[PDB]
């Protein structure tokens, strides 16, 4: 028993992280097959980032202007191209440590593990969620750009995030592995506004089911509610609206615990109106929304990877 903010094993990703250096800037890159993916602002100086013309800046660069290192072995760049906001550096050697992988664009509310790297070397791994406003509350220092987010399905590694920048508000923004930003952000050092950040209601409900499974049950109460009645209360407290697709995803958890989804919503409704009263749920004094229904099932059953 017990419940922890668990991240995927990062072994398969550590073997794909390399150090990419262009001119004076150095950041991390993802080496899969004979292609190295990295943020395109590696071709920028600190001055260029204020208002960069990436096309004009890439004209000045040649294949030999890029230094790709994997630990202590060098990689020769044979070709280069810009796909949206990522750079694709074609190298001569195919990464022998390439695992089975896909490129996936996740939706808000979904969770993934981040492997923070600096100078192509892994430093730590943690779990986080894609906020409804397409930002993540990560932990990134200068030089962490190019760090990737990923999920693991048995033997396949689904890459879903590449870190590109920290916003002036302290939150973080990035792209998928095709170079398309999550949200309305651009790879430029300017004041960019992130929308209102809302709580992922479906994740909170899944978290409450994990609490019941692990012995926390004080929040279970006497009432029930309707979808519209709850969504009305939820919107006042900046909670995502609950749809029928969310009820369907929680089905397996409802069957395990014998608590109807709508009954759990009534419990959450009271928690929203009356607070926690100094109590804790799974050791947390706040309502957690970084566990998806699949994460809860995964951790409460023991799904593994190879």
Provide, rounded to whole angstroms, the least separation between the CB of residue 228 and a second copy: 29
The two three-digit tokens of residue 176, written as one number = 């998928």
Q: Which residues make up the interface to a second copy (CB under 8 A)?
A: 1-12, 14-15, 71, 115-119, 121-126, 128, 137-144, 166, 170, 172, 214-215, 280, 283-286, 299-306
Provide, rounded to whole angstroms, the least separation between the CB of residue 98 and a second copy: 15
**What are the C-alpha distances in Å from 195 to residues 52, 132, 175, 212, 215?**
24, 9, 17, 33, 37
CA distance 171 to 131: 10
Q: Which does 182 bind (CB under 5 to 8 A by kind): a second copy, Zn ion, none?
A: none
Q: Which value, to the nearest 10 degrees, does the dihedral of the CA atoms of residues 58, 64, 67, 69 take?
A: 130
Q: Which does 137 bind (CB under 5 to 8 A by kind): a second copy, Zn ion, none?
A: a second copy
Provide, rounded to whole angstroms, the least separation between the CB of residue 27 and Zn ion: 6
* Closer CB to Zn ion, 109 or 179, in the complex: 179
Q: Does 87 bind Zn ion (CB under 5 A)?
A: no
Give the distance, in angstroms, between the CA of residue 72 and the centroid of all CA atoms in the same chain: 29
- Give me the catalytic one of 38, 41, 80, 160: 41
CA distance 198 to 235: 9
- Give me the catalytic one of 44, 145, 160, 265: 145
* Closer CB to a second copy, 8 or 112, in the complex: 8
Contacts of Zn ion in 123-162 (CB under 5 A):
145
Q: Does 86 bind Zn ion (CB under 5 A)?
A: no
Q: How many Cβ atoms from other residues are within 10 Å of residue 88's Cβ?
A: 17
- The burial of 287, by beta-carbon neighbours within 10 Å (0-12 exposed, 13-18 middle, 19 or more buried), is given as buried
List Cβ neighbours of 267 (8 Å cut-off, separation of 6 or more).
Answer: 208, 219, 220, 221, 223
List Cβ neighbours of 170 (8 Å cut-off, separation of 6 or more).
Answer: none
Provide, rounded to whole angstroms, the least separation between the CB of residue 279 and a second copy: 11
* Closer CB to Zn ion, 187 or 290, in the complex: 187
Provide, rounded to whole angstroms, the least separation between the CB of residue 137 and a second copy: 6
* Closer CB to Zn ion, 20 or 145, in the complex: 145
Q: Is the dihedral of CA 135, 140, 145, 146 positive or negative?
A: negative
- The burial of 5, by beta-carbon neighbours within 10 Å (0-12 exposed, 13-18 middle, 19 or more buried), is given as middle
CB 32 within 8 A of CB 16: yes
CB 34 within 8 A of CB 91: yes
What residue spans of 80-200 are helical by DSSP H? Answer: none
Provide, rounded to whole angstroms, the least separation between the CB of residue 166 and Zn ion: 8
41 is catalytic: yes
Question: Which chain residues interact with Zn ion by CB under 5 A?
Answer: 145
Catalytic (active-site) positions? 41, 145
């Amino acid at each position: 028993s017990g419940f922890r903010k668990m991240a995927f094993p990062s072994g398969k990703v550590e073997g794909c992280m390399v150090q990419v250096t262009c001119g004076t800037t150095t950041l991390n890159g993802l080496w899969l097959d004979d292609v190295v993916y990295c943020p395109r602002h590696v071709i920028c100086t600190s001055e260029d980032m204020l208002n960069p013309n990436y096309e004009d800046l890439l004209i000045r660069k040649s294949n030999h202007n890029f230094l790709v290192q994997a630990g202590n072995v060098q990689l020769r760049v044979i070709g280069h191209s810009m796909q949206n906001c990522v750079l694709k550096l074609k190298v001569d050697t195919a990464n022998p440590k390439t695992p089975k992988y896909k490129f996936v664009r996740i939706q808000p509310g979904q969770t993934f593990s981040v492997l923070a790297c600096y100078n192509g070397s892994p430093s730590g791994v943690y779990q986080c969620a894609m906020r409804p406003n397409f930002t993540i509350k990560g932990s990134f220092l200068n030089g962490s750009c190019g760090s990737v987010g990923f999920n693991i399905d048995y033997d396949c590694v689904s890459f879903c995030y590449m870190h590109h920048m920290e916003l002036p508000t302290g939150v973080h923004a990035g792209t998928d592995l095709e170079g398309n930003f999550y949200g309305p952000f651009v790879d430029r050092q300017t004041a960019q506004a992130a929308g209102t950040d809302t709580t992922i209601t479906v994740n909170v409900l899944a978290w409450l089911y994990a609490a019941v499974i692990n012995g926390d049950r004080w929040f279970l109460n006497r009432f029930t509610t309707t979808l519209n009645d709850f969504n009305l209360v939820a919107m006042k407290y900046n909670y995502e609206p609950l749809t029928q697709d969310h009820v369907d995803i929680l089905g397996p958890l409802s069957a395990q615990t014998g608590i109807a989804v709508l009954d759990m919503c009534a419990s959450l409704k009271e928690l929203l109106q009356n607070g926690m009263n100094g109590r804790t749920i799974l050791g947390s004094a706040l309502l957690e929304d970084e566990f998806t229904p699949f994460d809860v099932v995964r951790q409460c059953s023991g799904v593994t990877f190879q």
